Design a protein around this ligand. Sequence first.
Ligand SMILES: *[C@@H]1O[C@H](CO)[C@@H](O[C@@H]2O[C@H](CO)[C@@H](O)[C@H](O)[C@H]2NC(C)=O)[C@H](O)[C@H]1NC(C)=O
Ligand SMILES: *[C@@H]1O[C@H](CO)[C@@H](O[C@@H]2O[C@H](CO)[C@@H](O)[C@H](O)[C@H]2NC(C)=O)[C@H](O)[C@H]1NC(C)=O
Ligand SMILES: *[C@@H]1O[C@H](CO)[C@@H](O[C@@H]2O[C@H](CO)[C@@H](O)[C@H](O)[C@H]2NC(C)=O)[C@H](O)[C@H]1NC(C)=O
Ligand SMILES: *[C@@H]1O[C@H](CO)[C@@H](O[C@@H]2O[C@H](CO)[C@@H](O)[C@H](O)[C@H]2NC(C)=O)[C@H](O)[C@H]1NC(C)=O
Ligand SMILES: *[C@@H]1O[C@H](CO)[C@@H](O[C@@H]2O[C@H](CO)[C@@H](O)[C@H](O)[C@H]2NC(C)=O)[C@H](O)[C@H]1NC(C)=O
Ligand SMILES: *[C@@H]1O[C@H](CO)[C@@H](O)[C@H](O)[C@H]1NC(C)=O
Ligand SMILES: *[C@@H]1O[C@H](CO)[C@@H](O)[C@H](O)[C@H]1NC(C)=O
Ligand SMILES: *[C@@H]1O[C@H](CO)[C@@H](O)[C@H](O)[C@H]1NC(C)=O
Ligand SMILES: *[C@@H]1O[C@H](CO)[C@@H](O)[C@H](O)[C@H]1NC(C)=O
Ligand SMILES: *[C@@H]1O[C@H](CO)[C@@H](O)[C@H](O)[C@H]1NC(C)=O
Lengths: 49, 416, 49, 97, 131
Amino acid sequence: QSLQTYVTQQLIRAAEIRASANLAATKMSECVLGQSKRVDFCGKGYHLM
Amino acid sequence: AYSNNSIAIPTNFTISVTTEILPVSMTKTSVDCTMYICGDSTECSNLLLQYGSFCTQLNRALTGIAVEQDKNTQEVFAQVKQIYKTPPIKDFGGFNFSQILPDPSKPSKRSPIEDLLFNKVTKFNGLTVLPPLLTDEMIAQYTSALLAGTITSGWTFGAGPALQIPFPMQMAYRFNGIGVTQNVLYENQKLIANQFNSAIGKIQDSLSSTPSALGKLQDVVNQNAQALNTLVKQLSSNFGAISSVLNDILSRLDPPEAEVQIDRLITGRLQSLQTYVTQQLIRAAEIRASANLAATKMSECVLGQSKRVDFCGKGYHLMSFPQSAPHGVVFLHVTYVPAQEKNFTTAPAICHDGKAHFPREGVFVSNGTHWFVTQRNFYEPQIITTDNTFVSGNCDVVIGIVNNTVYDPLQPELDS
Amino acid sequence: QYGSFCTQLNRALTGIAVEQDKNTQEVFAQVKQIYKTPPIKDFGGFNFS
Amino acid sequence: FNGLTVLPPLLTDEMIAQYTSALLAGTITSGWTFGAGPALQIPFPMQMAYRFNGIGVTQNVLYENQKLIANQFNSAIGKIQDSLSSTPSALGKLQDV
Amino acid sequence: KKFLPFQQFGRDIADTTDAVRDPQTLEILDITPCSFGGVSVITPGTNTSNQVAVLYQGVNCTEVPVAIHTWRVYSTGSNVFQTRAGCLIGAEHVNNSYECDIPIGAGICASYQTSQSIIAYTMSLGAENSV
Ligand SMILES: *[C@@H]1O[C@H](CO)[C@@H](O[C@@H]2O[C@H](CO)[C@@H](O)[C@H](O)[C@H]2NC(C)=O)[C@H](O)[C@H]1NC(C)=O
Ligand SMILES: *[C@@H]1O[C@H](CO)[C@@H](O[C@@H]2O[C@H](CO)[C@@H](O)[C@H](O)[C@H]2NC(C)=O)[C@H](O)[C@H]1NC(C)=O
Ligand SMILES: *[C@@H]1O[C@H](CO)[C@@H](O[C@@H]2O[C@H](CO)[C@@H](O)[C@H](O)[C@H]2NC(C)=O)[C@H](O)[C@H]1NC(C)=O
Ligand SMILES: *[C@@H]1O[C@H](CO)[C@@H](O[C@@H]2O[C@H](CO)[C@@H](O)[C@H](O)[C@H]2NC(C)=O)[C@H](O)[C@H]1NC(C)=O
Ligand SMILES: *[C@@H]1O[C@H](CO)[C@@H](O[C@@H]2O[C@H](CO)[C@@H](O)[C@H](O)[C@H]2NC(C)=O)[C@H](O)[C@H]1NC(C)=O
Ligand SMILES: *[C@@H]1O[C@H](CO)[C@@H](O)[C@H](O)[C@H]1NC(C)=O
Ligand SMILES: *[C@@H]1O[C@H](CO)[C@@H](O)[C@H](O)[C@H]1NC(C)=O
Ligand SMILES: *[C@@H]1O[C@H](CO)[C@@H](O)[C@H](O)[C@H]1NC(C)=O
Ligand SMILES: *[C@@H]1O[C@H](CO)[C@@H](O)[C@H](O)[C@H]1NC(C)=O
Ligand SMILES: *[C@@H]1O[C@H](CO)[C@@H](O)[C@H](O)[C@H]1NC(C)=O
């Protein structure tokens, strides 16, 4: 029972980290390799780089 | 080779077609609790009813999962109010969509690429599989309507009434969108059409060559199937009891000890069911996230032209086309890539008569003897006139200014 | 006698382990080559030290 | 020591540093072109003028305020080290996980 | 099937037995587990009407009236439609197609109209248009 609970908690945490990694990848693709026009997606104010 | 007064400007372009594959839905299953725990036995149920409403919890979870799968498919595909159809005429100024439009010859209305995808992708213990609400023909018709609307109306049909427009004019629209003037397409239409057809043929050949690219979909099916098989295997274990078969222990021993044996078996099987349900819930959450991503891509990449970098394929984005697949969607992204670059010397401004001229849209380039103005993604020199440039300031503030003569088109007419 | 519990537990753990490397590769490996800055830092007054 | 192991990551940290350095060099010497296709050299002030036109300001503003913009950028980049080191709770997100 | 002379039963699915040698004589009989499935009740708003329909999920209609041991079904009680999702009792069949009022499955949707009060049809994806 203890091992099963630990494994389930690890799975949930891994899903959360996957979501964060996807967000980081999108931010890298758009904010770094370009000049995003989305508001507050790459920091407050008009985005330069 | 970085330097403070040197740039590289492309002189040619390539049209590329890439693919992206996204799973959307997962097989809807529902497991009868009492039938799985025990088969044709009253003592099982009488001992089981002490455990409360766990069966209701399991059934609620599975029903929610199935309804969410249906909602995922409906949200991803049903994005058009009408059902358009391409006219029988196949004149598009050179472009050829025979590999993506539906083929009436085949018994099932599908494009050749859809059939290629479909042919590349491959029970009695209370578990049942429910059919999806939307069959394959419905999603095929949805994809056909989306493709026909994209071909015959551009992006205007995604915001309001569909408006017809010739395909070369839509091509010029997209080219002006990415930052290249219309004359480039209107003068290289034949080359662009040939490259588009070649790219479509290449992607067909590449997809037909290997099935590993479809693994994203294929894996999913395996996972679900495995999560079923293991479950049935759990019915062949004693869980610390005398025998894994309920009938033999029931017919062998008297109530006051057969009951403890049955309690052991019930505990084990309930643990197995809980594990299966939790795994299904987590996998359903992941699939839902993927389906939401697919819906966003369909809404932005297909129904319009996306300015987000590396969102609808590598390079500057021109359009995309959708295709169906078992439990998934495949996007064909059509993008633009600069091909051949040339070196040029550069200056940020030009001093003419004590004033600085700045380019309106374009860059100043010198081939070593003269100065011209071009666009920023295709070499096209032009004489520097007062209409390509605007005047502001003096000749001593900017750093790196250069001396040249700015031509005035009004003066020769005035002299004449 | 308990069947195949810890085998699937191990499978889930290795799945998470693979997802970690997948996340890192997706986030960082977005460039096909490896560019290098010129030896002289002549950027018109800007400083990138 | 009771049946648990930690598997070293596939990518060593030096590889990550090299990747980030490559990205930085590309975005410094070629603007945003290396994302789409082949990298094309372009002077940095011209790239800044490109971005200024992108956010809706004509490029003469930068070409006449270059030195002031450079000084402000240098000061802002300098302040980041102090703003990070001085506060020991800045990195809480990673320490939490 | 064909069993080798030394074989008695077979396990094609590889976890359960589905074939056996005949006990009376030397033939071979296959075994299919007895049918079952969920029962769903399809109804409009209860304060609109009381007529309902019953959907036995995933089972042929040549079977519903006589197995279960309460309300009864009666063959004349409806047309007993046969859908890909299962056996449907209490609703008619209409060739026309409308929006999916109630999701049944496999492209079949049910609705209420004032001849049984409940009808089942093939869903219409939308009004056809040509540009
Ligand atoms: C731009 O590139 C395209 C192909 O990348 C060139 O088109 C080819 O041109 C050669 C000769 O120049 C022909 O033999 C090929 O048949 C052409 N390909 C196709 C598909 O038609 C094009 O000439 C290049 N343009 C410039 C100005 O260099
Ligand atoms: C679009 O391309 C297809 C090739 O995929 C063309 O189909 C060929 O048509 C010719 C003449 O009808 C046949 O001899 C070939 O066997 C066909 N090939 C295939 C693979 O079907 C089609 O004609 C092209 N359409 C247009 C308008 O150019
Ligand atoms: C730089 O471009 C200019 C403008 O085209 C070139 O000058 C012309 O060269 C052609 C030869 O291809 C002559 O026929 C024209 O008469 C020239 N223009 C004038 C006004 O005389 C120049 O040769 C180019 N330089 C280089 C190194 O390519
Ligand atoms: C561009 O041309 C102007 C004039 O044609 C140059 O201005 C000269 O600058 C020098 C250095 O201060 C003076 O000695 C001359 O008297 C100036 N000329 C005139 C007519 O006043 C200017 O230097 C040139 N710039 C470049 C980059 O070549
Ligand atoms: C960029 O800024 C750094 C400081 O962050 C400068 O490095 C300093 O250089 C001076 C000499 O000019 C030394 O006296 C300092 O000790 C250096 N500081 C450090 C922290 O090393 C660097 O010179 C600047 N470069 C440019 C091109 O502006
Ligand atoms: C780079 O540009 C310069 C012009 O400043 C030119 O002389 C040189 O040949 C170019 N290099 C190549 C490899 O074409
Ligand atoms: C460019 O760099 C060279 C150094 O080789 C220098 O002599 C020249 O003045 C610089 N020009 C500009 C506009 O920065
Ligand atoms: C329930 O009754 C009210 C008033 O009697 C009526 O307005 C409403 O439409 C009824 N519900 C439905 C689903 O028709
Ligand atoms: C029940 O109906 C299905 C419809 O597909 C048919 O395939 C099957 O043979 C039928 N069974 C009997 C016993 O009539
Ligand atoms: C209309 O429905 C009847 C069954 O009630 C069927 O026999 C007939 O073929 C249908 N006609 C059309 C045009 O679908």
